[PDB]
């Protein structure tokens, strides 16, 4: 049985436990290509099912995702409950290495679900984003305001009847918005943002944004302060919203790949991989081995690039401005190899449905060998220059520390989750893209996630990525760079240029789009900054019916208030430098 085969997952023990607890008629099991059991639960039993999953012998401890879907235009809904809208809850059990997708069906008039925040605190921002983009009200939410769009925004953009394209610009709207930007400091009310007891009169309100002098993006944090002590803080995000999901509903399966590049713009091919993997799951494509090793090579190269930039920016935020120049020279070496392979520096747009855009250029191994010889001495130099310095250690150790429980309840993944002592990497637990054929280690922490522990874990991850790159250079199969499937978009170019059936396939795939049959697919990968995921719903057309991108920087920014509570502003700056987030990843 192939990995893309449609499975109902009725042999999962979670289905049997749910049947024994709630009854055989309490839910509907859906057969998908997501790889996880999809269970449609009634709305009135949602909190009961969540509590039952939370109190399992090997419980589902992390709310991985929570969002909505507009099901009004979905023609192929066979074996599904009648739904105008739906809300899905993706929960991960690390102990079982399993996950379950609960789904709640809502009518068009009764668009309200009970809040999930009493079970999982990340449901705060997840439900705020669901309300902002779909208009679904969550009863019991502490403060259900818009998180992506401004508060004075009419309509909900991810609904099907909302126009995707840009409206006409008016200087009047900009000028009045400048007026509210002017009186926002004067007319600030903490009750709007969920804060309480604002201005006792021992607290002051501090706004860091909107523009920070850093490469992680532009955003605001409002802080309740007693002197230099932070008591309450909520981040103001949505300043980097690009409508990537709404764009996914109006681009074909092939023409959306450059938009998948700019989700985490320090990731590139790392961001391209889960999307093309989920599309290949929809298409029923098993890629050959050379495609797997090429994609692994480019993903590890871009992971090293992102980790180098993150370590450099953390060192610069500490105060040492020297190693960022040398590490950007190293990034220039990586960019030289990436320019040679894909033709571009930062957003290659090189992964394809079924393979990659071109074969590897003649001489890639030379550039890879020079880069692999160049890296370790520079890494040791950066280590001895800044990451073994006592001033950097005093600035970074013990700042914004959290344990395994806090990382599990807030959906923190990547360096922080492994620094809390939990060994969970997608490249080993749920392997993808032929990662089982590479010998590499997963670094883990002692059990407490400091800034320093996360930075050293990222350094060890860079070392392991260098090991993977060495294995890619030494052992590469000789064969096709595209699959032997009719849905490989585009087909190989020489056969397009001299065969007429291949020309027909190329013509209809680049113009109208490749036709993915109606199914739901899900791919979860380990990104450069945590765990990334693409959830793609196809209605049988040439475009995505629903593109849902889960990014870890959302969860990290939501964990920001729970970890910095009771600390200083400089601790907040060091924490922001030690998260490895981009605002495009948060806001997408």
């Amino acid at each position: 049985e192939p990995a893309w085969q449609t499975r109902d997952h009725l042999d999962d023990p979670v289905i049997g436990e749910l049947r024994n607890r709630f009854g055989p008629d309490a839910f509907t099991v859906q057969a998908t290509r997501t790889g996880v059991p999809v269970v449609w639960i009634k709305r009135e039993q949602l909190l009961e099912v969540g509590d039952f999953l939370k109190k399992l012998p090997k419980p589902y401890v992390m709310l991985f995702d929570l969002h909505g879907m507009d099901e009004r235009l979905r023609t192929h809904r066979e074996g599904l409950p009648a739904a105008d809208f739906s809300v899905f809850y993706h929960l991960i059990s690390i102990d079982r290495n399993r996950d379950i997708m609960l789904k709640v069906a809502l009518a068009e008039n009764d668009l309200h679900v009970p809040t999930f925040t009493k079970l999982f605190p990340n449901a705060n921002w997840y439900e705020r984003e669901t309300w902002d983009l779909f208009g679904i009200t969550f009863d019991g939410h502490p403060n259900l305001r818009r998180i992506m769009m401004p508060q004075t925004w009419k309509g909900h953009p991810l609904r099907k009847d909302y126009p995707a394209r840009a409206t006409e610009f008016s200087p009047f709207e900009l000028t009045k918005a400048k007026q509210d930007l002017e009186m926002e400091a004067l007319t600030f009310k903490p009750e709007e943002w969920g804060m309480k007891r604002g201005t006792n009169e021992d607290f002051m309100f501090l706004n860091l944004g909107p523009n920070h002098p850093s490469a992680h993006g532009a955003f605001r944090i409002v802080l309740q302060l007693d002197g230099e002590e932070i008591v309450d803080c909520v981040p103001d995000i949505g300043y980097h919203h690009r409508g990537a999901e709404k764009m996914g509903e109006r681009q074909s399966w092939h023409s959306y790949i450059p938009y998948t590049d700019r989700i985490e713009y320090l990731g590139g091919c790392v961001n391209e991989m889960p999307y093309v993997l989920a599309v290949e799951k929809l298409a029923g494509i098993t890629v050959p081995d050379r495609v797997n090793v090429i994609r692994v090579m480019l993903s590890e190269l871009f992971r090293i690039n992102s980790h180098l930039l993150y370590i450099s920016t953390f060192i610069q935020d500490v105060g040492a401005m020297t190693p960022v120049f040398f590490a950007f020279t190293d990034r220039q070496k990586i960019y030289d190899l990436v320019e040679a392979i894909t033709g571009f520096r930062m957003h290659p747009a090189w992964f394809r449905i079924g393979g990659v855009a071109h074969d590897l250029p003649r001489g890639w191994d030379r550039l890879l060998r020079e880069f692999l010889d160049w890296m370790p001495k520079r890494l040791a130099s950066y280590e001895k220059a800044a990451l073994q310095n006592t001033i950097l250690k005093g600035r970074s150790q013990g700042v914004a520390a959290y344990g395994a429980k806090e990382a599990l309840e807030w959906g923190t993944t990547g360096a922080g989750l492994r620094a809390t002592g939990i060994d969970f990497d997608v490249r080993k637990a749920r392997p993808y893209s032929g990662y089982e054929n590479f010998d590499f280690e997963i670094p883990v922490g002692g059990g407490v996630s400091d800034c320093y522990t996360r930075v050293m874990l990222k350094v060890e991850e860079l070392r392991q990525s260098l090991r993977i790159l060495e294995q890619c250079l030494n052992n590469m199969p000789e064969g096709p760079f595209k699959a032997d499937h009719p849905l490989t978009t585009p087909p190989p170019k020489e056969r397009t240029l001299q065969h007429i059936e291949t020309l027909i396939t190329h013509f209809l795939q680049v113009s109208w789009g490749p036709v993915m049959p109606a199914n739901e697919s899900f791919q979860m990968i380990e990104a450069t900054k945590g765990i990334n995921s693409y959830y793609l719903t196809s209605d049988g057309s040439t475009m995505s019916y629903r593109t849902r991108i889960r990014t870890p920087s959302y969860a990290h920014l939501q964990q920001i208030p729970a970890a910095i509570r009771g600390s200083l502003v400089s601790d907040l700056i060091v924490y922001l430098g030690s998260i490895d987030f981009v605002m495009s990843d948060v806001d997408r």
Partner: protein, 905 residues
């Protein structure tokens, strides 16, 4: 019937074959040679499914789903491995010889062969040998020929010969050298040869007029419109790119014009793209032609109209219901004049009275194909209402259909039906002044003047019913033919009588009404069809008004010092000298029009109105069905200086500026409400299409496909800043791809057909409830009237026989599909197709005048001597001269007029 496809049970129609039954269920089977309108032949061998004998069976057998009936308890599989392998192999065999031509082929992105190559999953070529090659032929100005792309699916020959009755397209050659085309280079003679570009699943037959300015299907902006070239009202999809009307595709209507248009509607659109059209309002001051915007034109016209003592309005059957009603509201009901002559209006009102008061059910265009005998009186259907002639051909083949059904032969087995019914056909009796294009299938043809055809009709009605008025003076041979017609009509279960206003005689319409009443009195299921002239002739007849002669009399007498002419050239309904004198005497002439007409040289004000591609409105076709047509594109999107509005918008704004001295343009639904509130006869036009607030789950209807391209570069040569998307406040459609065009959307107006995997016109199968039937949620268009409870009385006004008087010549009308409609001659592709302007002469009259064939003769009509070359017409009765109606210099009002001093120049 009960069938089981891939283990899933379905209920289908047992009289259908498995291919159309499974396509109606939403299942996908590739097919080439089968068509819903043409039946099954089993040629392309593409639709192979695996049939099993019973519920438990593992071997099966590859059967042909188009050739296999969907009987009760059938077991088939589509996704069987052997069936899929064979379908991919059939695609591969078709692709062995196919040219590497998709980038330079006009069927690219619209190709059924491309769709089925992709859908079978064939993308790898292992064939390494040569590909066969064919030379091409010149098929005329409309169809472009490329025989290399043929897959030998035999659709073209089957449609063109068996369905459309054409004789000049066939299949030649042998084993793999089969050639589909004409026996020699020449124009395709059929009036329905344009449907080959949709019948052909490949790019062998392509729209050449579209090919001149070619763009792909995904790049088109489509709208659901009504063809404006005669009164049949065929549903069309005009598609636009870069501010010009690019193509007319057939839009499916299961009640009117299901899969097929005629060549006048498909290739006569080129007047929209003419460069001499008015794009701005123009005011004539002395010798200068100054250009205004909309507001100053409205203010100036309102001021001058307010100073006038009486403003009259001359409508037209070209304009929609809303434009005519807005003109009627602006000038007043008693000052509104229909733009047609007195005789044309009298014939139109009589045909309307017969239709909506005669008690006989008038059929739709699809319903015509089920009648058992057809009598066409006076009307040249193929040149005036061509789609009715096609439906008459199908009704004639109905006898072979019945003969094959009597032998338990399935109705989709077209070859067996044609073999059983060899040459037996339902009776067709056509009367005209000469031979018609229906004569190859007609049981009898009567070449006689209009009075003699009316007398023949009155005699048929008297022989059917003795209470009908009798005709004295019938020859014994003509009486024998009369009783042959009467015996054929009386034995028919469903007789159909077709007449119209194009014969130029009231008595022909009266005789057809008498025949229909006599057949109704015998208990027969008689239907009556009346063919009008223009797109909204029925609408102008229902709304009514004075004739053009009364308007010219008011202008000449000085009682009217202001005339507003709406979408009328005024020369097809009256003499040019009289119109020019009356318009020159008027101190204000104001022409609201979208085509540069000859009456704008004396016009004081010209309003740049919109054509059907740039306007919304309602038109009433010949059967009395109200149909809404929608705007295709915004003319001001590309050229921002273009101020071209709807005619009803112009006239409503003029009425508002005349009354309240303020400008209000309108919304379209406001004008629709005004029409249905003030004219109860036109109250049914509200249900023709839903209002502008109609949504499909909250979103509008997309005009263009979702892969519409060039949004940030197509206007970049003017300005790099992208403009506002045009807002359509009038209708429910949006000028963007941000809309709904789902096949399952609860709507009736479909701008274009597209399904994922079905890019060709075969996506209409996805847009129908059953394949070849109606649309899923009904067809657009609502009949304005029901059939009457009681009929009329017999028309006792029997005319005398035609007497050829000396020194005078009766003008026999000759109509052409290319040349008689006013707007179609303006299309520059038609001048290569329109015939040379002739004059038809009987051999005895030509010998009496000493003129041969081809010599020039000069005749004076209304004191205007024009010369034409002589063509000898054998079937024309003596004492008559035949003139081509609607051409240059020959108005259609000249039908039945007398001609003086016809003499060789």
């Amino acid at each position: 019937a009960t069938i089981h496809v891939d283990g899933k049970e379905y209920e289908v129609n047992g009289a259908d074959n498995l291919l159309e039954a499974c396509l109606s269920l939403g299942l996908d089977i590739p097919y080439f040679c089968w068509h819903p309108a043409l039946g099954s032949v089993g040629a392309c061998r593409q639709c192979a499914v695996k049939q099993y004998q019973n519920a438990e069976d593992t071997r099966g057998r590859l059967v042909m789903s188009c050739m296999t009936p969907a009987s009760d308890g059938t077991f088939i599989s589509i996704d069987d491995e052997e069936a899929k392998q064979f379908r991919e192999s059939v695609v591969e065999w078709l692709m062995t010889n196919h040219p590497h031509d998709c980038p330079v082929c006009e069927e690219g992105g619209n190709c059924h062969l491309q769709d089925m190559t992709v859908m079978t999953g064939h993308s790898f070529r292992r064939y390494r040998f040569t590909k066969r090659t064919h030379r091409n032929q010149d098929l005329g100005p409309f169809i472009s020929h490329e025989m290399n792309r043929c897959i030998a699916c035999y659709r073209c020959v089957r449609y063109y010969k068996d369905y459309a009755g054409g004789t000049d397209l066939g299949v030649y050659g042998a084993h793999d050298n089969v050639y589909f085309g004409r026996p020699e280079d020449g124009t395709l003679e059929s009036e329905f040869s344009g449907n080959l570009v949709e019948i052909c699943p490949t790019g062998v037959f392509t729209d050449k007029t579209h090919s001149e300015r070619y763009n792909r299907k995904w790049d088109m902006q489509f709208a659901p419109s009504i063809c404006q070239q005669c009164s049949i009202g065929c549903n069309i999809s005009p598609g636009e790119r870069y501010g010009e009307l690019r193509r007319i595709e057939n839009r499916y209507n299961g009640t009117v014009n299901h899969y097929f248009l005629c060549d006048r509607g498909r290739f006569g659109y080129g007047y929209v793209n003419l460069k001499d059209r008015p794009r701005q309002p123009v005011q004539r001051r002395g010798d200068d032609f100054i250009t205004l915007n909309a507001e100053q034109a409205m203010q100036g016209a309102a001021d001058i109209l307010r100073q006038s003592k009486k403003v009259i309005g001359i409508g037209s059957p070209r304009a929609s219901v809303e434009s005519n009603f807005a003109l009627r509201e602006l000038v007043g009901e008693e000052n509104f004049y229909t733009g047609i002559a007195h005789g044309e209006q009298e014939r139109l009102q009589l045909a309307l009275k017969v239709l909506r008061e005669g008690g006989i059910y008038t059929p739709a265009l699809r319903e015509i194909e089920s009648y058992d005998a057809v009598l066409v009186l006076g009307e040249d259907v193929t040149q005036t209402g061509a789609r009715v002639a096609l439906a008459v051909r199908q009704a004639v083949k109905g006898k072979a259909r019945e003969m094959a059904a009597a032998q338990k032969v399935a109705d989709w087995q077209i070859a067996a039906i044609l073999n059983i019914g060899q040459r037996a056909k339902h009776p067709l009796f056509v009367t005209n002044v000469d031979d018609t294009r229906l004569d190859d299938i007609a049981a009898w043809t009567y070449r006689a003047p209009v009075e003699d055809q009316a007398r023949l009709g009155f005699a048929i009605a008297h022989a059917l019913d003795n209470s009908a008025p009798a005709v004295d003076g019938i020859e014994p041979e003509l009486q024998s033919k009369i009783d042959v017609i009467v015996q054929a009509l009386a034995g028919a279960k469903k007789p159909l009588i077709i007449s119209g206003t194009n014969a130029g005689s009231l008595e022909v319409i009266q005789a057809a009404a008498n025949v229909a009443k006599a057949l109704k009195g015998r208990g027969a299921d008689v239907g009556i069809t009346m063919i009008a002239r223009s797109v909204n002739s029925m609408g102008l007849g229902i709304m009514g008004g004075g004739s053009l002669e009364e308007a010219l009399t008011e202008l000449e007498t000085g009682r009217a010092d202001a005339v507003v002419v709406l979408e009328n050239d005024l020369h097809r309904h009256a003499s040019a000298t009289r119109v020019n004198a009356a318009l020159a005497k008027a101190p204000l002439v104001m022409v609201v029009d979208h085509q540069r007409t000859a009456i704008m040289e004396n016009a004081h004000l010209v309003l740049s109105a919109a054509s059907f591609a740039e306007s919304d409105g309602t038109v009433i076709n010949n059967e009395g069905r109200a149909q809404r047509f929608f705007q295709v594109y915004d003319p001001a999107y590309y050229d921002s200086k273009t101020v071209m509005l709807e005619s009803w918008r112009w006239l409503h704004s003029l009425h508002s500026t005349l009354l309240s001295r303020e400008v209000d343009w309108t919304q379209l639904d406001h004008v629709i409400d005004a029409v249905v509130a003030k004219i109860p006869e036109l109250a049914g036009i509200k249900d023709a299409a839903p209002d502008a607030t109609f949504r499909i789950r909250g979103q509008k209807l997309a005009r263009e496909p979702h892969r519409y391209s060039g949004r940030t570069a197509m206007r970049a040569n003017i300005s790099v800043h992208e403009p506002r998307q045009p807002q359509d406040i009038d209708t429910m459609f949006t000028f963007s791809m941000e809309g709904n065009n789902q096949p399952t959307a609860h709507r009736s107006q479909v701008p274009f057909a597209w399904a994922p995997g079905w890019n060709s016109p075969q996506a209409w199968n996805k847009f129908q409830d059953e394949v070849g039937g109606k649309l899923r949620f009904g067809d657009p268009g609502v009949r304005l009237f029901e059939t009457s409870e009681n009929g009329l009385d017999y028309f006792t006004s029997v005319p005398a026989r035609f007497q050829p008087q000396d020194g005078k010549w009766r003008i026999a009308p000759y109509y052409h599909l290319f040349g008689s409609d006013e707007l179609s001659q303006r299309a520059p592709v038609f001048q290569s197709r329109m015939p040379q302007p002739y004059i038809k002469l009987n051999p005895a009259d030509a010998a009496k005048l000493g003129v041969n064939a081809g010599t020039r003769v000069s005749f004076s009509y209304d004191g205007n001597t024009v010369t034409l070359p002589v063509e000898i017409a054998e079937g024309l009765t003596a004492g008559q001269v035949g003139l081509p109606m609607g051409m240059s210099g020959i108005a259609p009002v000249l039908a039945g007029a007398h001609l003086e001093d016809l003499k060789e120049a």
